[PDB]
């Protein structure tokens, strides 16, 4: 049995978005299907479902203002019409069948692995790099603020302290990114000896290297 | 519509022990819940239906019961795959399903308080008319924590974002990194900025702090 989504991806505010999901390892046109999609606070919500054949679909909301749900039979394929969307629906989306005894439909028995969804109309823009000295055994920190799309790569030194260094996951902010990175070194000695986050943007060609300022 | 609330978010247990989690409905569901889980690694699998059916392909160490509005999972001998998040949902209804907001269990580690520290603006970031101060909080256990800022003593909560890491895997502990951002001017003003942690090992907060006019 499989569920394999596809048609994740960037898309700007107001924009538009087919997902689709191939189905195997069953007959397909024997269940009920469903869309689910996890918000980034990681709450679960059930988008559409649509029945056996294909002539019913089940939205909370809205009928056709944003979600419209389909099956092509033949094909094994599950759809999901996106269209005119905001940030919120930022998630990622799962395929799922739909699974009754006697005879509700009421559980989910088999989902897909989901599609990432990014709603932004950001421009890609590169990360400003800011070393973080203390104030005012000792710890670091490298602040990396204001980069699209996601992700960047942080490395300290080169680095021989590959240990002992804590990432923390970026947050949207301003419309943009915000992560940050610590190490923590030997107090004797430092800063006798420099210190250096490399940062790495790789959709803006960027590559910044900070030293560890006072 | 039909809400389902879940007591707690995450829960500590140990290898081999007894853990139970609770669901608690706004309405009675008629036994038509479900359980999943989702791995770290974002899978999902379904693991009990109509209260406690379990779903083939899963181990009987999981088991579920409930009535009503009231119904829990237990996972007997928790075993090292089990580390992960559990969702109940209501099936009652066609398309009105709802989700519990999740319940995260991890391994439980002694209880660590965090190491601390806080650090001032970078000249460099201040040229940019922007001032960020950050406080970095660093392997602790249990990951219940609360981290508030001070400006000369009196607390803020806007424009602070707050960041966790993964437990780590090697150690079991987490950490986390609590950003202010405010604009250089603001900044200037000023002259105390606080970090205060409150840990379930503190009692009184932990804090670190510092003043721009040395």
């Known amino acids: 049995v499989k569920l394999v989504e596809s048609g994740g991806g960037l898309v700007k505010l107001g924009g538009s978005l087919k997902l689709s999901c191939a189905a195997s390892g069953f007959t397909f046109s024997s269940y009920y299907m469903s869309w689910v999609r996890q918000t980034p606070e990681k709450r679960l919500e059930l988008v559409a479902a649509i029945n056996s054949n294909g002539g019913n679909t089940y939205y909370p909301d809205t009928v056709k203002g944003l979600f419209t749900i389909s099956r092509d039979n033949a094909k094994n394929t599950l759809y999901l019409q996106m269209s005119r969307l905001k940030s919120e629906d930022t998630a990622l989306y799962y395929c799922?069948?739909?699974?009754?005894?006697?005879?509700?439909?009421?559980?989910?028995?088999?989902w897909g692995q989901g599609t990432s969804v990014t709603v932004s109309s950001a421009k890609t823009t590169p990360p400003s790099v800011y070393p973080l000295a203390p104030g005012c055994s000792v710890t670091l920190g490298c602040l990396v603020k204001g980069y699209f799309p996601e992700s960047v790569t942080v490395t300290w030194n080169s680095g021989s302290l590959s240990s002992s260094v804590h990432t923390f996951p970026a947050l949207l902010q301003s419309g943009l990114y915000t992560m940050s990175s610590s190490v923590t070194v030997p107090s004797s000695t430092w800063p006798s000896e420099t210190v250096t986050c490399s940062v790495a943007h790789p959709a803006s060609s960027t590559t910044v290297d900070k030293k560890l300022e006072p | 519509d039909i809400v389902l609330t879940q007591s707690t978010s995450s829960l500590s247990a140990s290898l081999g022990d007894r853990v139970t989690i609770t669901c608690r409905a706004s309405?009675?569901?008629?036994?038509?819940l479900s359980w999943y889980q989702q791995r770290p690694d974002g899978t999902v699998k379904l693991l009990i239906y109509?209260?406690?059916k379990l779903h083939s392909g899963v181990p009987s160490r999981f088991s579920g019961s409930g009535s009503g509005t009231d119904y829990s999972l237990t996972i007997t001998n928790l075993e090292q795959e089990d580390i992960a998040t559990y969702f109940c949902q209501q099936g009652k209804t066609l398309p009105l399903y709802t989700f519990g907001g999740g319940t995260k269990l991890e391994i439980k580690r002694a209880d660590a308080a965090p190491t601390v520290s806080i650090f001032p603006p970078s000249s460099e970031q201040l040229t940019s008319g922007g001032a960020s101060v950050v406080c970095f909080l660093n392997n602790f256990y249990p990951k219940d924590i609360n981290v508030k800022w001070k400006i000369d003593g009196s607390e803020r909560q806007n424009g602070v974002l707050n960041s966790w890491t993964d437990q780590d895997s090697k150690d079991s502990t987490y950490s986390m990194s609590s950003t202010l951002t405010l604009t250089k001017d603001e900044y200037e003003r000023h002259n105390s900025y606080t970090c205060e942690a409150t840990h379930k090992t503190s009692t009184s907060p932990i804090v670190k702090s510092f003043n721009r006019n040395e």
């Open positions: 309405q009675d569901i008629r036994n038509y």
């Open positions: 109509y209260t406690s």
């Open positions: 799922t069948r739909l699974y009754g005894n006697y005879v509700r439909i009421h559980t989910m028995d088999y």
